Amino acid sequence: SPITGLVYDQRMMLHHNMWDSHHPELPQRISRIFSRHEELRLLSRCHRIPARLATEEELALCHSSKHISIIKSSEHMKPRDLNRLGDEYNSIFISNESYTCALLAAGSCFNSAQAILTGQVRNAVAIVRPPGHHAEKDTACGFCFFNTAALTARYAQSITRESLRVLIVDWDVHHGNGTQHIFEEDDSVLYISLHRYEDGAFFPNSEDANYDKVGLGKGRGYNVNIPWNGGKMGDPEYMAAFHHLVMPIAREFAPELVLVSAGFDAARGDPLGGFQVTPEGYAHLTHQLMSLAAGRVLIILEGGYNLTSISESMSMCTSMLLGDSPPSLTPLKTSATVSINNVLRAHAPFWSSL
Ligand SMILES: O=C(CCCCCONC(=O)c1nc(-c2ccc(N3CCCC3)cc2)cs1)NO
Ligand SMILES: [Zn+2]
Ligand SMILES: [Zn+2]
Ligand SMILES: [Zn+2]
Ligand SMILES: [Zn+2]
Ligand SMILES: [Zn+2]
């Protein structure tokens, strides 16, 4: 009867860094977001979707059995061994609760996707950790263990039809390399990422994130990278990318389900991103995406490390999902226009609306 679903479970707080309790991927990222939804009176307006563990068979939709095996083995490791295993990846910490939390993150999003696709709710928001989009088929990376968003997209296909057109918009400030690679040869899933690039000087520090990686084989044109260079990007920049690139392509793709890899580390005040997108900015992005897929949008928390900025930003997205009017509203930075024009040029061969 509520149109918007919401999934949050404090067990996902159990994932922690044993050797640095102040690591930015904090447990209270999700609880602060949830707590803010309560303050802004959005929680009463949402249907509460239960969290569940993703099954191993569901993980296998995207991830190798080897990968699965290793992350599962972490459950019964001593601190010394957690430390060792952790340091085999780029930017990873592990606790005994990490695996459960990563399962909970994915399963929550599966339930949310199922609630949308069965008409229980129109749209949903997933306040989950740890994040997902850096997770490859074979490896963890960048605080991510499994690719929640990628898995949810496959889950959706498997409970509907395999050709179900799924759009993934990734506005985390980092490139979702794992998501890109998983669907790199897929024309049924459209990946669109905006991220700080700085010619590969920004994590995850690869040319994979550049505008010229457009997908492979059948997937040619179904991977859209929008890299930012030499600019403190904000609302004008993201609004322009949406108007010129994201929304035109998305409309032409005509998805049946929209998944947002919603990192809020492009927000003003975020220590890792150093960009200045506002909560109102994020609202207007959500609002625009809701014109797709009859409003069937699933917002999935990725990055974002300023507790105030992420709590405010994500609550605003939920407000849009609930059907509220956007809050109101600077000329575009040059380098942003350079970036946009490079992407227009690279994707003109695929999308006629460009
Ligand atoms: O978001 C993600 C995943 C993030 C993975 C990024 C790379 O791996 N790790 C990092 O960069 C880290 N950097 C910090 C850090 C940097 C700057 C500051 N500060 C600058 C000013 C003062 C405070 C504080 C903390 C902690 S770890 N995916 O979407
Ligand atoms: Zn309200
Ligand atoms: Zn991104
Ligand atoms: Zn693709
Ligand atoms: Zn591209
Ligand atoms: Zn990020």
Distance of alpha carbon 265 from alpha carbon 84, whole angstroms: 28
Q: Which atom of ligand 1 is nearest to the CA of 172?
A: 29
Beta-carbon-side half-sphere exposure of residue 239 (alpha carbons within 13 Å): 19
Which entry of 16, 37, 67, 134 is annotated as an active-site residue? 134
Residue whose token pair is 């024309």: 187
Residue 353 exposure: Cα atoms within 13 Å on the Cβ side: 13
Resolution of the solved structure (Å): 2.1
Integer Cα distance of 228 and 199 in angstroms:
9
Q: Whose CA is nearest to atom 7 of ligand 1?
A: 203
Residue positions counted in the chain:
354
CA distances from 186 to 140, 172, 183, 240, 259 (A): 22, 22, 5, 27, 16
Q: Give the residue extent of every domain in the chain.
A: 2-354
Pick the CATH number of 2-354 from 3.40.800.20, 3.40.50.1820, 3.50.50.60, 3.40.1830.10: 3.40.800.20
Tokens describing residue 227: 């890299």
Least distant ligand from the CA of 194: 3
Q: Is 134 a catalytic residue?
A: yes
> Using a 6 Å CB cutoff, which residues line ligand 1?
24, 91, 131, 133-134, 142-143, 172, 174, 203, 263, 265, 271-272, 302-303
Residue numbers preceding breaks in the chain (C to N > 2.5 A): 329
